[PDB]
Short mmCIF file of C-alpha atoms in Angstrom, two decimals:
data_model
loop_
_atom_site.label_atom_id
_atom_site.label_comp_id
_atom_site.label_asym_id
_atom_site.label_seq_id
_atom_site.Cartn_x
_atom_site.Cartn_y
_atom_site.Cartn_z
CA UNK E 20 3.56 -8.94 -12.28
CA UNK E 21 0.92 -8.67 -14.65
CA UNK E 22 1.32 -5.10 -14.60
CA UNK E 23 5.10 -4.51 -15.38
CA UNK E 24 6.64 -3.88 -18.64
CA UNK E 25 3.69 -3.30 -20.68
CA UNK E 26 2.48 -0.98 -23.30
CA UNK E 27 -0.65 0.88 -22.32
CA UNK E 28 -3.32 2.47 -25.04
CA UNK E 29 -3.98 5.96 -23.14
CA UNK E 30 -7.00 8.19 -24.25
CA UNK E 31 -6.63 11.88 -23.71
CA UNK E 32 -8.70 14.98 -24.68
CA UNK E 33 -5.81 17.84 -23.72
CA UNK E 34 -8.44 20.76 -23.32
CA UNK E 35 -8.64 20.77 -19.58
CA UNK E 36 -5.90 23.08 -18.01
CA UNK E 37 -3.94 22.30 -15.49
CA UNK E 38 -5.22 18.39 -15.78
CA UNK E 39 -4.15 18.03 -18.91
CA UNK E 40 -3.53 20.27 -21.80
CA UNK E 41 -1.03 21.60 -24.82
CA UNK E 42 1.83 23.86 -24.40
CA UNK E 43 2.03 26.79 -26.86
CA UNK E 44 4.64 24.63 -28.43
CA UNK E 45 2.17 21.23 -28.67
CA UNK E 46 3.96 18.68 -26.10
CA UNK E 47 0.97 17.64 -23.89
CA UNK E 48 1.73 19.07 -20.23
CA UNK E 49 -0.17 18.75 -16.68
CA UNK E 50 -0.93 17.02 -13.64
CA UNK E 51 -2.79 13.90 -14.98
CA UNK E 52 0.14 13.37 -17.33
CA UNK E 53 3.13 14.36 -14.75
CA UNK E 54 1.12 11.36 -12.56
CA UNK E 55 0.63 8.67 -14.80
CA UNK E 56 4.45 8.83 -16.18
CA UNK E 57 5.78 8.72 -12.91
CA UNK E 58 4.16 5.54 -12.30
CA UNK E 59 4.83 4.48 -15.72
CA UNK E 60 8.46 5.16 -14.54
CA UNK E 61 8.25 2.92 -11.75
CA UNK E 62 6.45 0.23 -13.30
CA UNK E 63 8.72 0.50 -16.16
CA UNK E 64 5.45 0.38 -18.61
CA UNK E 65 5.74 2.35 -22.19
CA UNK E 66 2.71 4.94 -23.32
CA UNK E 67 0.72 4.62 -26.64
CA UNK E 68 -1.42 7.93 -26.42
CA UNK E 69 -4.28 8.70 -29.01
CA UNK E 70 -6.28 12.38 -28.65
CA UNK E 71 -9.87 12.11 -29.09
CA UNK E 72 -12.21 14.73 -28.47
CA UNK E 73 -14.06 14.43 -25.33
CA UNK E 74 -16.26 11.60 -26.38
CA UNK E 75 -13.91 9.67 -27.99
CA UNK E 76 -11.45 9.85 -24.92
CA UNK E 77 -14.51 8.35 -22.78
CA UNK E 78 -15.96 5.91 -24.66
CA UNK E 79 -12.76 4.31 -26.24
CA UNK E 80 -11.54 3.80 -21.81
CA UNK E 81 -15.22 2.70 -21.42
CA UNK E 82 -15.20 0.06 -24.99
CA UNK E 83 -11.78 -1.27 -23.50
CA UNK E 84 -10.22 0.34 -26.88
CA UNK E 85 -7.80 2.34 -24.41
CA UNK E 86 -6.33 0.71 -21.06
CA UNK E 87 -6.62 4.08 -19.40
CA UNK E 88 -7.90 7.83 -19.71
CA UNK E 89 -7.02 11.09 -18.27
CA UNK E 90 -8.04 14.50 -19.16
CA UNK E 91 -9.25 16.07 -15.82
CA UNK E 92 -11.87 13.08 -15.76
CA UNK E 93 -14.97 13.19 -12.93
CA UNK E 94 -15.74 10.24 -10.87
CA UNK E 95 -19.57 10.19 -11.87
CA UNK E 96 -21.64 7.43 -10.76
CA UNK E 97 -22.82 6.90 -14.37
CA UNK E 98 -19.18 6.48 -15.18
CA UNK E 99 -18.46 3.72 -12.96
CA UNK E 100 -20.60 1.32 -14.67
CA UNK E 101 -18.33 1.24 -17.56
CA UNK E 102 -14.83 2.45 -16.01
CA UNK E 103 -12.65 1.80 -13.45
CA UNK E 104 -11.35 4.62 -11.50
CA UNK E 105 -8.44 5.62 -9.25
CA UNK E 106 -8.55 7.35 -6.07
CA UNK E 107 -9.59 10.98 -6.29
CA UNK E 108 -6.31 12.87 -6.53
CA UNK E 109 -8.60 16.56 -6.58
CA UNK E 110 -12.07 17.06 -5.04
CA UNK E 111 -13.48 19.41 -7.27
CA UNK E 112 -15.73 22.38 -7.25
CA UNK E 113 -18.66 23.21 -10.24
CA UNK E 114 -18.74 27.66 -11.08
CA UNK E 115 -21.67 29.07 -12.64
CA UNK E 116 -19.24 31.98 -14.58
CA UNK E 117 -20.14 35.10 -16.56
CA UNK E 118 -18.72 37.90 -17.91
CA UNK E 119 -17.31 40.08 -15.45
CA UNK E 120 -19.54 43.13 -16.69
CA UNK E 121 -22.51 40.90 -16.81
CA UNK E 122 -23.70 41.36 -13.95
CA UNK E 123 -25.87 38.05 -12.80
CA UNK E 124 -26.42 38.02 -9.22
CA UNK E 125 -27.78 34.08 -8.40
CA UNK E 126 -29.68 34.05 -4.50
CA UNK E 127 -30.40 30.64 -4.90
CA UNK E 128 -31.20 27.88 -7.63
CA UNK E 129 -34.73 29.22 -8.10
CA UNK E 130 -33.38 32.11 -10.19
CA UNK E 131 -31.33 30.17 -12.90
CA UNK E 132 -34.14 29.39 -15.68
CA UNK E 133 -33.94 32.87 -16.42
CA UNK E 134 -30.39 32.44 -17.91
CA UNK E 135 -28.71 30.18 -20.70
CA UNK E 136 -25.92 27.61 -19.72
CA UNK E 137 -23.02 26.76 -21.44
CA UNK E 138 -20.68 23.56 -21.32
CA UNK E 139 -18.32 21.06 -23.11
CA UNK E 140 -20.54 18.10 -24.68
CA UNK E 141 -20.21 15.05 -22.56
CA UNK E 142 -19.09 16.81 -19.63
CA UNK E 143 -20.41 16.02 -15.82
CA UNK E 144 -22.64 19.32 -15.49
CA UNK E 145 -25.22 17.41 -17.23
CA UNK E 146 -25.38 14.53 -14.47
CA UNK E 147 -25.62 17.40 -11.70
CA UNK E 148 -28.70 19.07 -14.13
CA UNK E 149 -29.90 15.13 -14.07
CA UNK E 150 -30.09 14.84 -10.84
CA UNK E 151 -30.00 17.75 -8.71
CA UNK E 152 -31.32 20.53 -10.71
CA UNK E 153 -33.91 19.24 -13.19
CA UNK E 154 -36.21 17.48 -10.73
CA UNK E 155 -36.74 20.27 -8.33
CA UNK E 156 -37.54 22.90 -11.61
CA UNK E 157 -34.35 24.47 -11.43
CA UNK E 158 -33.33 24.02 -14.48
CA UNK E 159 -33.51 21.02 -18.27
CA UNK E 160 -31.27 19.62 -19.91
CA UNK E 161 -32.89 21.12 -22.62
CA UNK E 162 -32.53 24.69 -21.70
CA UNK E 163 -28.52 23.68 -22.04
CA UNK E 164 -25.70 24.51 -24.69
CA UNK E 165 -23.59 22.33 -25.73
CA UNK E 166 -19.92 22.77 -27.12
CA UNK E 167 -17.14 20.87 -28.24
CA UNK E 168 -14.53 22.10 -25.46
CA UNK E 169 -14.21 24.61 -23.17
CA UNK E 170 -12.74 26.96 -25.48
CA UNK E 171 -15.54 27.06 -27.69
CA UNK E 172 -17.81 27.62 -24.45
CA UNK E 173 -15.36 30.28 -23.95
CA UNK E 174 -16.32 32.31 -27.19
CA UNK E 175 -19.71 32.34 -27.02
CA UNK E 176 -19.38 33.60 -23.04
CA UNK E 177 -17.15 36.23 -24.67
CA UNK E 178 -19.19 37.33 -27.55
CA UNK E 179 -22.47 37.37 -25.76
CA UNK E 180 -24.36 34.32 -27.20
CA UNK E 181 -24.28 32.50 -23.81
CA UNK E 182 -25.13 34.19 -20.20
CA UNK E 183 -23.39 31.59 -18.04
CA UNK E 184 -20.32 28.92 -18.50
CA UNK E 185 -20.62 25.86 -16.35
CA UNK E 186 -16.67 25.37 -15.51
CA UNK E 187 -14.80 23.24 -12.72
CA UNK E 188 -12.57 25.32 -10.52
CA UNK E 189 -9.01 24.57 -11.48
CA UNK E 190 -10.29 25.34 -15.80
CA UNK E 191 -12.10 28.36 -13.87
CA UNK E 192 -8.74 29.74 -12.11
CA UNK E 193 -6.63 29.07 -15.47
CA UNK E 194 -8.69 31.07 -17.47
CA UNK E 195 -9.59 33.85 -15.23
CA UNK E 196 -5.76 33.96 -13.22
CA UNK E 197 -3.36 32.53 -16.11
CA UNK E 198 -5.14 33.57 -19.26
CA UNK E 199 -6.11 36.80 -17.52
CA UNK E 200 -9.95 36.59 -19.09
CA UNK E 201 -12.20 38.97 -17.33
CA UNK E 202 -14.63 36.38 -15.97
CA UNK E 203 -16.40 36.12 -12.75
CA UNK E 204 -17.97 32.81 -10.75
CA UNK E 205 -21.95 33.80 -9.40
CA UNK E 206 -22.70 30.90 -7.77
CA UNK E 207 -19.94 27.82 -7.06
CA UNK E 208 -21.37 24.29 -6.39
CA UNK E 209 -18.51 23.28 -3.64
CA UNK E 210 -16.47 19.84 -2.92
CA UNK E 211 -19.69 18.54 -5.42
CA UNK E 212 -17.32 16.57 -7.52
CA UNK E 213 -13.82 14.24 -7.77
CA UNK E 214 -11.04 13.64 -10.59
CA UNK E 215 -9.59 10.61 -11.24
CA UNK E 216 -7.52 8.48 -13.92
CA UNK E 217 -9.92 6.08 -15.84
CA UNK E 218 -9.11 2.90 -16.35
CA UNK E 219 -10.60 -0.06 -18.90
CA UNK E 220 -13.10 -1.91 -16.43
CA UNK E 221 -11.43 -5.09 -14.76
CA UNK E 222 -8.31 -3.32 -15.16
CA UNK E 223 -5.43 -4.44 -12.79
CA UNK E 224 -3.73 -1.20 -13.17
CA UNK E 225 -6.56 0.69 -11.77
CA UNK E 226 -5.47 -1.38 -8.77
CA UNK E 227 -1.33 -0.90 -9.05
CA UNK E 228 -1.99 2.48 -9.81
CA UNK E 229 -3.53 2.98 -6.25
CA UNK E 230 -1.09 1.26 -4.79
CA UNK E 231 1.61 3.64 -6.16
CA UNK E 232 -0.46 6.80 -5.03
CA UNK E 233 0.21 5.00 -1.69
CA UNK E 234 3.46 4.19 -2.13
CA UNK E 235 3.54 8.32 -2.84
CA UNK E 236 2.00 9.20 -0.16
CA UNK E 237 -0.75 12.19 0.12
CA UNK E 238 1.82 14.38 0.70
CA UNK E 239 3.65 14.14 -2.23
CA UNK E 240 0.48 13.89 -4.73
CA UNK E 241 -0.97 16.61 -2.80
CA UNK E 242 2.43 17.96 -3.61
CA UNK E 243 2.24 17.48 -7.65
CA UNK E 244 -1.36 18.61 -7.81
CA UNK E 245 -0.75 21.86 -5.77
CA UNK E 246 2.56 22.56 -7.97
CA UNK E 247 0.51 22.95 -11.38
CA UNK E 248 -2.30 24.62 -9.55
CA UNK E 249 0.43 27.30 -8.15
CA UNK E 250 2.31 27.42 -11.70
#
């Protein structure tokens, strides 16, 4: 094996609940973590994780710095120039969210100039601006806000500063179901997107990694996923 026994530099940016995140206590918890131990487990390889902010996590997996990266990562096509990815182990949904006594009723993408846009720097929303919503007049990139994570998004829904929070589904539910914030979805780009684990391009693990998600089974990753999505 070239893959056995090793000691892997892992990049994580724990601000994207239930993918991966920090317990009241600190310990990092969630899916992308519960997966990548397990196979760590089986391949009887040993974990040397750094925390970066969003950027950081990304481009030290894309320098080769870090071997692999998880936080809730999309598989964007501009991403897969520079990264490796797994299999999608979520196919993921994009929420347009306000406050819940904002009342923004969207018919269709012709109405959304009219309101500000919120999201974590570095995130995949601006791709989908890129490339679906910029060229037809629906929206800029320029028109956007930018924040550090999606807390800080969070506040400035909350206080008024921003009228709408870009936000994938599972970050959506955890805020609005676990953390009990009164926020409501207006418009939900559906099955638009996919989360992986990133990998340093060339990487062979990207490959044995796969190969244990088979060795899994769908059922049983299905299984894991669905189990912090339920929590």
């Amino acid at each position: 094996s070239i893959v056995e026994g090793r000691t892997l530099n892992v990049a994580v940016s724990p601000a994207s609940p239930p993918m991966l995140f920090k317990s009241a206590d600190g310990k990092l918890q969630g899916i992308d973590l519960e997966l990548f131990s397990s196979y760590c487990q089986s391949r009887h390889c040993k974990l040397n994780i750094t925390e970066y902010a969003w950027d950081g996590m990304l481009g030290a997996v894309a320098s080769g710095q870090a071997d692999v990266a998880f936080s809730g990562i999309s598989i964007t096509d501009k991403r897969k120039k520079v990264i490796d990815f797994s299999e999608p182990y979520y196919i993921n949904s994009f929420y347009l969210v306000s406050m819940a006594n904002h009342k923004i009723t969207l018919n269709n993408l012709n109405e959304l100039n009219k309101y500000s846009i919120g999201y974590p720097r570095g995130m995949a929303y601006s791709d989908l601006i890129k490339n679906d919503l910029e060229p037809k007049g629906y929206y800029s990139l320029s028109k956007v806000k930018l924040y550090p994570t999606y807390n800080e998004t969070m506040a400035d829904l909350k206080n008024g500063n921003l009228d709408l929070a870009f936000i994938e589904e599972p970050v959506y539910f955890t805020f609005k179901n676990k953390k009990k914030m009164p926020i409501e979805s207006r418009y939900v780009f559906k099955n638009v997107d996919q989360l992986g684990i990133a990998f340093k391009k060339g990487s062979p693990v990207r490959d044995d990694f796969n190969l244990w998600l088979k060795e899994q089974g769908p059922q049983k990753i299905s299984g894991i996923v669905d189990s912090w999505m339920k929590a």
